[PDB]
Design a protein around this ligand. Structure first.
Ligand SMILES: N[C@H]1CN2CC[C@H](O)[C@@H]2[C@@H](O)[C@@H]1O
Length: 851
């Protein structure tokens, strides 16, 4: 008694092949030719699992899937054994897209009118229907239409999954307990402002589902303190048990990564009846305080544990077909940290519990909320996809808020819930959301929208969604003059410069030779792996600025090499600008969510890391920007700026800024010593680079930060032009601002050959990981830097070992200079091969060294 076991898997088939719905869940039902699938599968995932269609990640494979078959229901069916019918039996689940009939042993226990909406939780007492031995359960899962159903959809991020994700994407728990069922155990936690004392209020529901009145004792531990309450329950009665306040002295406060540890406490409760355990629940919570208030400029400002914070993050997405794997979730979040980011946004598609656990454990902050552009906003978004709400929609959306509030309330990573995205909810829908949260004791900041749209009750959003979402040059980010644009000011909830060409290794796995030929030759042509949206269907704006700024592409390799430079440069400036302006007295930047962190699939835009966890110019660019102790060059005013992200003020820093023509001639040098800079996003200005006579059209700026012990702590190399990027502001659309003039960076085409310079070694650790160390030296006999040198852990065939975490990469080294790099990865991902390192540079060619 106190049992909860996930159904491990099902066999599935279309309802096309089922003429008697009641037959499915009778024990002995034949399933010849049904598809075996693991827990958490959409129909199409399940069919991929059985190898029924080709790899959707490659080319247009996904188009060749007949989608008609997903406009009818599919059954999810499994046996369940019950050795003893002393215990009551429950199905507890969520994640049904879009709705389902639930059947046990030939009886319909619930219909799609009740079991409706992806986020709604259901706790079905199936005691009457369960017998000794073999029992069976079947879900008739109805088709998903994200515009019709309070569910999940893909907006314009990728292309539409053939099944629109229908199926059961979270676990179904089979629960067993006595007369009393224990549900919804949480801990309300309140930290004093000094962070040295907390008050914990444990609440938990007991439900008596027996025929007779009972006395139940709910007892156990919170944070290692004993607790006990005894209440009476009438037959069929459910109560909320509030426990007396527990004081917790000098708590182990949960902090964001790099600000402290990520301790979580345990709540462990047993409901007993008649001196015997009836049900039990274990959970965790973190002791932490969060706020998100409007500053004096109307900007939404977050703080954790009293500490103000520039949110620096990206929009997280799951797999396009909602295929779940815990390790991969963890790898994805681990990359957030490798990037130097502190936050991920979840525009809908809110992930299963474990994702929040991992987030908690690693100290990555999360911004979950509902999504735009479909049913969720169908009642306030007018002409945009998403159907106006009917009366039955209201209780489903309210039940969805409650369920999520309940799942999410105790995860310290969560800093807010967005109740709208593009459109704030109206007063009726908003009251529904506030009531649901109140009832779940969900006490986090509620943000009305991610755009500037206010809601009637909560009010101003303190954010903006002004774009861009496609190509803009670096200096665009430094704008504070255009208040309908996406410059570094207020809270940038979702923005990027669009196209993000992945590594050549990802390219070759995701597109044909012909597809790739077209991409570089005709950026204007439609690419299946960008977007279903006509607006983001092609790479025209990107191709156009690429040619203009770096020069026309001679071939695929040329296109890709320049693509990476552009993405690095662009993403770098996007974050750097927001970091700099965070400490403006007037309209500070309070947030940045890059659009996006990752893609749901193999893609050509809106990503820092690709679907295979490979790392390109955009990744390395985000990583440079987000260094904890960082030196940066402002593209607007040519000031060299030091940013300290750490939880401690730093002193005795020197900032060295040097300019070089492409022939290697130093044309400017400045050394600023004894720099202090405060903690947590504060900045300091080293120098403003003056205009310098005699710079080559394309030149380099070498920015170096060294601490008091002389250690180089940040190195930052910019390829700059004597010719400015300038904006045609009045030509701005919602998704970009075109350029009145373009920079000339094409000199890189003729940057002379340098050389490197490489040694490598690997240690297999006892923790299951290998650390490959690589020493790079510029070994040339001249004056030329080894520019943009990318190191890759590869196996013996030269295929990248992924996921991987480097301390630094994409380095530039001047003659004689040396750097030592560290790469870490699971030993098992070598798949038995010895490790090597592939080293390629803009002007140093490609070599691979054993390691
Ligand atoms: N929140 C929305 C806001 N949209 C504005 C432009 C783009 O369609 C973007 C969506 O990707 C995103 O999902």
């Amino acid at each position: 008694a106190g049992n909860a076991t996930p159904i491990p898997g099902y066999v599935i088939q279309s309802s096309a092949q089922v003429s008697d719905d009641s037959a499915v869940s009778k024990p002995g039902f034949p399933t010849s030719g049904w598809y075996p699938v693991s827990s958490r599968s959409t129909v199409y995932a399940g069919l991929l699992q059985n190898g029924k269609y080709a790899d959707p990640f490659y080319s247009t494979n996904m188009q060749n899937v007949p989608a008609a078959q997903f406009s009818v229901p599919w059954w999810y069916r499994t046996d369940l054994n019950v050795d003893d019918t002393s215990s009551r039996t429950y199905l507890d689940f969520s994640g049904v897209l879009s709705k389902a009939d639930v059947w046990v042993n030939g009886t319909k226990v619930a219909t799609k009118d009740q079991v409706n909406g992806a986020y709604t939780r259901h706790d079905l007492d199936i005691t009457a229907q369960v017998h000794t031995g073999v029992n069976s359960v079947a879900f008739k899962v109805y088709p998903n239409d994200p515009n019709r159903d309070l569910s999940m959809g893909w907006i314009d991020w990728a292309q539409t999954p053939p099944d629109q994700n229908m199926g059961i994407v979270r676990d179904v728990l089979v629960r067993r307990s006595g007369a009393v069922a224990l549900r919804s155990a949480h801990v309300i936690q309140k930290l004093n402002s000094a962070l040295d004392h907390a008050d914990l209020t444990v609440k938990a529901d007991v439900r008596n589902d027996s025929a007779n009145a009972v006395q139940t004792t709910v007892a156990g531990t919170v944070a290692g303190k004993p607790i006990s309450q005894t209440v009476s329950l009438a037959a069929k009665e459910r109560k909320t048990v509030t426990f007396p306040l527990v004081g917790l002295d000098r708590p182990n406060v949960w902090w964001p990564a790099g600000m402290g540890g990520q301790h979580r406490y345990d709540l462990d409760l047993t409901a007993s009846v008649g001196g015997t355990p009836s049900d039990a629940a274990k959970s965790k919570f973190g002791v932490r305080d969060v706020k998100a208030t409007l500053n004096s400029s109307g900007g939404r400002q977050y703080s954790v544990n009293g500490k103000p914070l520039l949110i620096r993050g990206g929009g997280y997405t799951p797999d396009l077909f909602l295929r779940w794997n815990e390790t991969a979730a963890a790898d994805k979040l681990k990359y957030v940290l490798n990037l130097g980011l502190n936050t991920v946004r979840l525009e809908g598609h809110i992930e299963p519990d474990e994702f929040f656990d991992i987030a908690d454990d690693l100290g990555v902050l999360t911004m979950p909320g509902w999504e735009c552009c479909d049913k969720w906003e169908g009642q306030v978004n007018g002409e945009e996809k998403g159907e106006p709400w009917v009366e039955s929609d209201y209780p489903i959306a309210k039940a969805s808020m409650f369920s999520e509030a309940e799942r999410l309330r105790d995860h310290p990573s969560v800093i807010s819930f967005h109740i709208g995205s593009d459109f704030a909810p109206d007063r009726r829908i908003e009251q529904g959301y506030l009531d649901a949260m109140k009832a779940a004791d969900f006490l986090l900041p509620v943000i009305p929208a991610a755009s500037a749209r206010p809601s009637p009750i909560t009010g101003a959003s303190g954010m903006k969604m002004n774009g861009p979402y496609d190509y803009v040059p670096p200096v665009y980010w430094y704008d504070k003059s255009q208040k309908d644009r996406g410059g570094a000011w207020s809270f940038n909830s979702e923005t990027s410069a669009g196209v993000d060409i992945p590594t050549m290794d990802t390219l070759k796995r995701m597109m044909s030779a012909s597809e790739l030929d077209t991409m570089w030759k005709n950026p204007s042509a439609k690419q299946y792996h960008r977007s279903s949206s006509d607006t983001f269907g092609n790479l025209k704006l990107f191709g156009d600025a690429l040619t203009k700024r770096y020069g026309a592409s001679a071939n695929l390799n040329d296109f890709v090499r320049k693509a990476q430079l552009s993405q690095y440069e662009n993403v770098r400036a996007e974050f750097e600008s927001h970091s700099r302006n965070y400490t403006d007295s007037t309209n500070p930047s309070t947030g940045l969510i890059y659009w996006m962190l990752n893609s749901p699939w193999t893609s050509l835009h809106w990503q820092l890391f690709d679907a295979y966890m490979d790392q390109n110019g955009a990744y390395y660019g985000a990583k440079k920007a987000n260094e904890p102790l960082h030196i940066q060059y402002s593209h607007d005013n040519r000031s060299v700026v030091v940013i300290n992200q750490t939880s401690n003020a730093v002193s005795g820093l020197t900032a060295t800024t040097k300019l070089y023509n492409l022939d290697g001639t130093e044309k400017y040098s400045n050394t600023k010593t004894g720099l202090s800079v405060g903690a947590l996003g504060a900045k300091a200005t080293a120098v403003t680079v003056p205009a310098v006579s005699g710079l080559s059209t394309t030149y380099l700026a070498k920015n170096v930060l060294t601490d008091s012990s002389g250690k180089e702590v940040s190195r930052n190399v910019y390829w700059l032009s004597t010719k400015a990027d300038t904006l045609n502001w009045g030509g701005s659309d919602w998704y970009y601002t075109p350029q009145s003039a373009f920079a000339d960076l094409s000199g890189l085409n003729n940057l002379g050959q340098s050389a490197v310079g490489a040694t490598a070694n690997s240690v297999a650790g006892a923790d299951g990981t290998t650390t490959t160390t690589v020493t790079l030296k510029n070994t040339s006999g001249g004056r030329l830097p080894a520019f943009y040198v990318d190191s890759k852990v590869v196996d013996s065939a030269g295929k990248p070992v992924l996921p991987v975490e480097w301390n630094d990469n994409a380095v530039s080294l001047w003659p004689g200079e040396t750097t030592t790099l560290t790469a870490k990865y699971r030993t098992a991902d070598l798949k038995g091969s010895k490790p090597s390192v592939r080293i390629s540079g803009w002007n140093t060619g490609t070599q691979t060294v054993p390691a």
